[PDB]
Amino acid sequence: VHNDVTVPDFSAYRREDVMDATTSSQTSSEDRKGFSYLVTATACVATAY
Amino acid sequence: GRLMDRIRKWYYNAAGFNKYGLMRDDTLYEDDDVKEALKRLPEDLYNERMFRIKRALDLSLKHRILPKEQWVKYEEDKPYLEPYLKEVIRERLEREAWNKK
Amino acid sequence: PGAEDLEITKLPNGLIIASLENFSPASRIGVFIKAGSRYETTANLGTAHLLRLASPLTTKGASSFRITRGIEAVGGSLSVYSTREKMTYCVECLRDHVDTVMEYLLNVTTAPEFRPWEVTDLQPQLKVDKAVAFQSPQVGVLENLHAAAYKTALANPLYCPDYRIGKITSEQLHHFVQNNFTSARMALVGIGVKHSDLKQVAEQFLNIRSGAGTSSAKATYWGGEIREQNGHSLVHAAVVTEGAAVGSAEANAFSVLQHVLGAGPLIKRGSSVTSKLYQGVAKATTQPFDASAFNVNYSDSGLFGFYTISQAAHAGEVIRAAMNQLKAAAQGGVTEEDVTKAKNQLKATYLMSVETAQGLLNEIGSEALLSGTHTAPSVVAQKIDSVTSADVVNAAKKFVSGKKSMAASGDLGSTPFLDEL
Amino acid sequence: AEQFLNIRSGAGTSSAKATYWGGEIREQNGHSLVHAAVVTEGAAVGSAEANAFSVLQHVLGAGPLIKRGSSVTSKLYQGVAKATTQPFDASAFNVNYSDSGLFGFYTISQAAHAGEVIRAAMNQLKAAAQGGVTEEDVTKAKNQLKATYLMSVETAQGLLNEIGSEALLSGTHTAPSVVAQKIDSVTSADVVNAAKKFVSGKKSMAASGDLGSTPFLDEL
Amino acid sequence: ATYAQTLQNIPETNVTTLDNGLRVASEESSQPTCTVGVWIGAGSRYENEKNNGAGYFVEHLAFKGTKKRPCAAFEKEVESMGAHFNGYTSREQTAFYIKALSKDMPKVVELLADVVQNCALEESQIEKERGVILQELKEMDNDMTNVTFDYLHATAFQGTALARTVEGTTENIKHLTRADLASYIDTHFKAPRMVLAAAGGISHKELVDAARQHFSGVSFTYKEDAVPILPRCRFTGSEIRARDDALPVAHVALAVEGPGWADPDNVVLHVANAIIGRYDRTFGGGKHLSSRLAALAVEHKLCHSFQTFNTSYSDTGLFGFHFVADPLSIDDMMFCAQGEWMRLCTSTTESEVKRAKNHLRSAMVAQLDGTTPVCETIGSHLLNYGRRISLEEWDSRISAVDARMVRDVCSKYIYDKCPALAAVGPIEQLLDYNRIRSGMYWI
Amino acid sequence: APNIRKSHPLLKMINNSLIDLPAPSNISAWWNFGSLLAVCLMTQILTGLLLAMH
Amino acid sequence: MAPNIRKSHPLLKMINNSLIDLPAPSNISAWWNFGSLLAVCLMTQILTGLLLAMH
Numbered sequence A: 001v002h003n004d005v006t007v008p009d010f011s012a013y014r015r016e017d018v019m020d021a022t023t024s025s026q027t028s029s030e031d032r033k034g035f036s037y038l039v040t041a042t043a044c045v046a047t048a049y
Numbered sequence B: 001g002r003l004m005d006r007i008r009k010w011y012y013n014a015a016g017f018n019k020y021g022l023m024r025d026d027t028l029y030e031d032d033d034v035k036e037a038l039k040r041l042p043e044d045l046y047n048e049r050m051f052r053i054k055r056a057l058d059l060s061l062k063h064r065i066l067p068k069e070q071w072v073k074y075e076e077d078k079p080y081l082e083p084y085l086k087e088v089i090r091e092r093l094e095r096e097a098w099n100k101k
Numbered sequence C: 001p002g003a004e005d006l007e008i009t010k011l012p013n014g015l016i017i018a019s020l021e022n023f024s025p026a027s028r029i030g031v032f033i034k035a036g037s038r039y040e041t042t043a044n045l046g047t048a049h050l051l052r053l054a055s056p057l058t059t060k061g062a063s064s065f066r067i068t069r070g071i072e073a074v075g076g077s078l079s080v081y082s083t084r085e086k087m088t089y090c091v092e093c094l095r096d097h098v099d100t101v102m103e104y105l106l107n108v109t110t111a112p113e114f115r116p117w118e119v120t121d122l123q124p125q126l127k128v129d130k131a132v133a134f135q136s137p138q139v140g141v142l143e144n145l146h147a148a149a150y151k152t153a154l155a156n157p158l159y160c161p162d163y164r165i166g167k168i169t170s171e172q173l174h175h176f177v178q179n180n181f182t183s184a185r186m187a188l189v190g191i192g193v194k195h196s197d198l199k200q201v202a203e204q205f206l207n208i209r210s211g212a213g214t215s216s217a218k219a220t221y222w223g224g225e226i227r228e229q230n231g232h233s234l235v236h237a238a239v240v241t242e243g244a245a246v247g248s249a250e251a252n253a254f255s256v257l258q259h260v261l262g263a264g265p266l267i268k269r270g271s272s273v274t275s276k277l278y279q280g281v282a283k284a285t286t287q288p289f290d291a292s293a294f295n296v297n298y299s300d301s302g303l304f305g306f307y308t309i310s311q312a313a314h315a316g317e318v319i320r321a322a323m324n325q326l327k328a329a330a331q332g333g334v335t336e337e338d339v340t341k342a343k344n345q346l347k348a349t350y351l352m353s354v355e356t357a358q359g360l361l362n363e364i365g366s367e368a369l370l371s372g373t374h375t376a377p378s379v380v381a382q383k384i385d386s387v388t389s390a391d392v393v394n395a396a397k398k399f400v401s402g403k404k405s406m407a408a409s410g411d412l413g414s415t416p417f418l419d420e421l
Numbered sequence D: 001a002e003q004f005l006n007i008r009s010g011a012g013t014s015s016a017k018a019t020y021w022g023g024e025i026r027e028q029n030g031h032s033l034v035h036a037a038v039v040t041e042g043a044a045v046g047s048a049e050a051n052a053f054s055v056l057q058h059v060l061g062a063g064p065l066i067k068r069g070s071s072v073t074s075k076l077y078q079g080v081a082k083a084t085t086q087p088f089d090a091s092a093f094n095v096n097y098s099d100s101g102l103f104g105f106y107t108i109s110q111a112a113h114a115g116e117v118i119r120a121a122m123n124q125l126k127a128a129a130q131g132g133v134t135e136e137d138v139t140k141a142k143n144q145l146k147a148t149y150l151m152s153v154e155t156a157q158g159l160l161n162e163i164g165s166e167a168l169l170s171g172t173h174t175a176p177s178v179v180a181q182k183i184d185s186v187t188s189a190d191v192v193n194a195a196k197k198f199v200s201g202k203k204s205m206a207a208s209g210d211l212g213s214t215p216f217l218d219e220l
Numbered sequence E: 001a002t003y004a005q006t007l008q009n010i011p012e013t014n015v016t017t018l019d020n021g022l023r024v025a026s027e028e029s030s031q032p033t034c035t036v037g038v039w040i041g042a043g044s045r046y047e048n049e050k051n052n053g054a055g056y057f058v059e060h061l062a063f064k065g066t067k068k069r070p071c072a073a074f075e076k077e078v079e080s081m082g083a084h085f086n087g088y089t090s091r092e093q094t095a096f097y098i099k100a101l102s103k104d105m106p107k108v109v110e111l112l113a114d115v116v117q118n119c120a121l122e123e124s125q126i127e128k129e130r131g132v133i134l135q136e137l138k139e140m141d142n143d144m145t146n147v148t149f150d151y152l153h154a155t156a157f158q159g160t161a162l163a164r165t166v167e168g169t170t171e172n173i174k175h176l177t178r179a180d181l182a183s184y185i186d187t188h189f190k191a192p193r194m195v196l197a198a199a200g201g202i203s204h205k206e207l208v209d210a211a212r213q214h215f216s217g218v219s220f221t222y223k224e225d226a227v228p229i230l231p232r233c234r235f236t237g238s239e240i241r242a243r244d245d246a247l248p249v250a251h252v253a254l255a256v257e258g259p260g261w262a263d264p265d266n267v268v269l270h271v272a273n274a275i276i277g278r279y280d281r282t283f284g285g286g287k288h289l290s291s292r293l294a295a296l297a298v299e300h301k302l303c304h305s306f307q308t309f310n311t312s313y314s315d316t317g318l319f320g321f322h323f324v325a326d327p328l329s330i331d332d333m334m335f336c337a338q339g340e341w342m343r344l345c346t347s348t349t350e351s352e353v354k355r356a357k358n359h360l361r362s363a364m365v366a367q368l369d370g371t372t373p374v375c376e377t378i379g380s381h382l383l384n385y386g387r388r389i390s391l392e393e394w395d396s397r398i399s400a401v402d403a404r405m406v407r408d409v410c411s412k413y414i415y416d417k418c419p420a421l422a423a424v425g426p427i428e429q430l431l432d433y434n435r436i437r438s439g440m441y442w443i
Numbered sequence F: 001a002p003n004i005r006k007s008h009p010l011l012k013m014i015n016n017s018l019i020d021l022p023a024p025s026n027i028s029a030w031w032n033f034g035s036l037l038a039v040c041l042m043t044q045i046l047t048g049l050l051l052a053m054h
Numbered sequence G: 001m002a003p004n005i006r007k008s009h010p011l012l013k014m015i016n017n018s019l020i021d022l023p024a025p026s027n028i029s030a031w032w033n034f035g036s037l038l039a040v041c042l043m044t045q046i047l048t049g050l051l052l053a054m055h
């Protein structure tokens, strides 16, 4: 039955800031996205250039 | 004074859709409002309109018109869709007005 | 000021008006009517079902569009409930919007236009509405039950038969409304409103002349048996007999016998000990099951018996066991304390039934419709407990001796026929 | 057969005995025409009482013999005809199974006249149960029966079916003379009895159409 | 009598605390009938890997008899008085309540206390319910909507406590011990974490009196009267896809992390959800429904039904939507659904909120339609807000909400967030996470 | 599909635009200039290439 | 007809069905990159070629 289903462990892949299950993941969200989007924004700059 | 009747009867005859056996309403461009109205027409009125149109297209392709005795007469032209179409437009305007409200 | 009166005027044309201020922040008005599949004849079967769904169509005063947008504009709601013999159109909304919502309730019940195209478009909905309803086997057997219990009127199905989906006409909808939605068959009941206000609305807006319009044919008992072999692991069965009708000292007898036999669970996942019927079936079968005392009261008739649900293989024993509990009861096997307990559950039930706005309003209007009056919750209790142990045992006998009608669906391979009970 | 047929011997699983119910099923489907059938446990295959019903069948009316023509030799048809003005059809129904059989009549009528048409068909059965059967009626029916049977075997499909049917339920073959010998050797009494067995026996009914005017088995 | 006046004239909710830490609250009316029960701040979230499904297992025995009165006796007594005994267990909240005649409020209170304190936990009943529960798990496994919400929590809160289901695991149910259930009860069913609530025709002082008489067993140490704060459950933008093309329709649920009970923003989220609303193929309203998504659903036959939600908890929550659609219309549905969410954050109208607010008011008023629903509010309110919140306060808060507020709050919890997704059934047409993630911005 | 004119991914296109294409039964000579314009285009390109080669 | 232009518009419909919603195998490797590179050389060659052709 579905009750016996659980999401596996993604620790071998999680970003450092969301590794701990007892910590809100929202506090590091803006950084996690800021970084990724920073790369994208920079690629757009190099491309525009 | 009855000036319109003079003019509207002249125009009707000048227009000439009646030479194909078409009613005024048979010639309306099918925009959204008209399309909706047509769906509300009773079966027979619908099937009748269809025949008149198919027949006219056959006339148009043949490059002929109907014998003068079959031309619809200004005063016998049936405004079969106008009532429906008006309700349709009214409803639409109501929704429109209301959606700004 | 939680001590308001339950007024109840009654205009000259026969329209009954019952109101009641409870100062609740929400008002729930309704238009009760004596209409239903009961008044349909072969020719217009299902027309009452479609009419139930046609509540949102355009009227002479409001368009389909405004009826929905209007009511929603003020967090209001509009619904229509119906039985084989009564249709209720009620609207709920916050106090300060009763005027708003009312226009719509009015237009829907008195000024429908049943435009041909809107009707044609709506009919396919009957399939959908019906398909979801029939997901509960309960509904299917009850339909067949009334078809086996009667030859007419009440025998008519509550959901439009399939061969007629798409065939009902605007004419039929109009004629039904004209010949049934008459001021003398209607009732404007309301809660969270002031009688003077509701009373005013009625006399000023409700039109559609009085009269009893076409009267329904009398309900003739058949005592038939319909079996639907559909293969389901569970078998639903109902066995009944003609019981008391609405308004009867006999009614109360069956109600009590109902609660004495077993009228539904009271403890979550708990067994029902105070249930003669359940306890009996339980002793007979080891597998999951469910037995209950069935009971319906209509204007000119009623049905009484038991409804079971069991695994296919044990249907036989489960149904017979339920039968013995009825005989055993007809033969004085009813304690005097049993009748005492049942009377509590009955008084309690009734009392709880009115906790919700939907329940209170339905109780008021139902009575305010079949007798333009209102029995005090004390007179009703006074009438119920004043039911001897004899009465009950008699009700039980009337069942064992009366001609029975039955309906069952599922893998009926082990389900007994009415003549083996 | 012998050198090829291998799925072997035994009587295999035997069927359960046929238990009579005498129920009533009504399908309200709105059709302009109402088909209805009323029957009673009839005779079984090989049951001596079979020929009796066969003859009573032909005496009441077992199908048309004249194209677009009326059936005068049909007690049942003629009776219904007298009752209704509209198009209809009535016939004596009859089935013979291994351990049971069914006998009665099948009608087809406009919805509004179903009531009278069905009742009319019933009276023709009572009226027959009450000696209302001529000795000549039984003579004529015996011809139609002998004839029918004899024609049935004209086509390869019919001949083969006749042979095999019997060659299966008794590994034998009755001479077309013994079958005729058995049929006409059926008294006028027998027939009237068959007719009685119907009027007294518990009946089962089935009807479909706009049953608004179709009567229930307990009103017949 | 105006809506306002009616809101102010509603009897106040009385609260009084006993020395043992239990809280007794009730709202008085003039009804011969009433509902009373104890709302416990317990549930699956309080369980762990070894005792998951205990609180549920307990919920099954809480009605099979106490020490003072075995099964049959317990049942007969309640049945014979026409009282109704129901209850439930969830992730953060449990409840056992009785519907009865105000005339019995006191006997009931005694019964409640006896249930929560002296459950017989019959050794033989335990093995019996063990099989019943196992059957209920197979029954619920066919309830797509609930399988979908379980999965939604399983991934949205993966690795944590809210990830577990209320009913528990198959292994737990097969091995939970009489001692485990006992331990559960003693550990969680405790005075300071419970609330005796009642509504109907009852004397607050009579209620609290019977309360003092039966809810005694005070605590000695400090560890016994302190309400344990639970460890935070981490939210995770992710998805779980359980595919079975053999299923007739597909269920999809998408959600972002919610604020949690105490946060005022919840009033705004509920208004927001009110704009999008909900729908199902039997809403006569049809193509004229105010909810844009509902309108599109009808016009394009996008789904069989859909619904928004703002599930709260102590420190977190799930704000999202769920729909049921044919395998071939999932993509357009998800497209429009996400589209509307974008509209919320970006182009909400004053008209939109005006309506949503009315809708919300009548919705809160509806959740107080009877003694049980009102009693539920009280229990939940004290247990979550540590105090009852009048309809007048709610209405006060609801009234302050405007389009701009909806946009900022919605932008706050929705815009450019990584959602949690659960898809069950014939879900091939549902595009990947990255595609969905992009529907989270611009709209 | 039973006949290639409809199944083949390329013919399918020719069929839906120059063979089974539904056309009004009454269009006149004024509807001939579309195809004529197409032919001018093909003609111009062909003669233009030939000229461009010198 | 359709709720979103990416699918109803007769031109976008084409871009969507070949470069946006086009179903692709999840495991194709770098060897499946040369198709698009070939397309880009083609557009690149044409562009530079016209530019050269103009002188």
Ligand code: HEM
Residues within 6 Å of the ligand: F041, F044, F045, F046, F047, F048, F049, F051, F052, F053
């Ligand atoms: C839309 C189709 C075309 C139009 C309307 C068009 C029109 C013209 C015009 C106005 C001239 C001048 C004729 C004159 O000498 O008086 C011209 C010249 C020329 N065209 Fe085109 N042309 C078309 C397509 C082409 C194509 C596709 C090519 C080559 C691949 C081409 C190659 C030439 C060349 C080489 C000349 C110069 C020789 C000459 O003047 O006769 N043309 N074209």
Ligand code: HEM
Residues within 6 Å of the ligand: G042, G045, G046, G047, G048, G049, G050, G051, G052, G053, G054
């Ligand atoms: C499939 C794309 C093409 C290929 C493979 C290609 C290849 C070549 C090659 C091998 C050369 C000689 C380069 C050299 O000078 O050593 C050349 C020359 C040239 N190509 Fe292309 N070409 C392509 C398309 C075009 C197009 C579209 C045009 C013009 C509209 C064009 C115009 C020229 C011109 C004018 C030259 C002469 C100038 C030069 O040699 O650099 N090419 N091309």
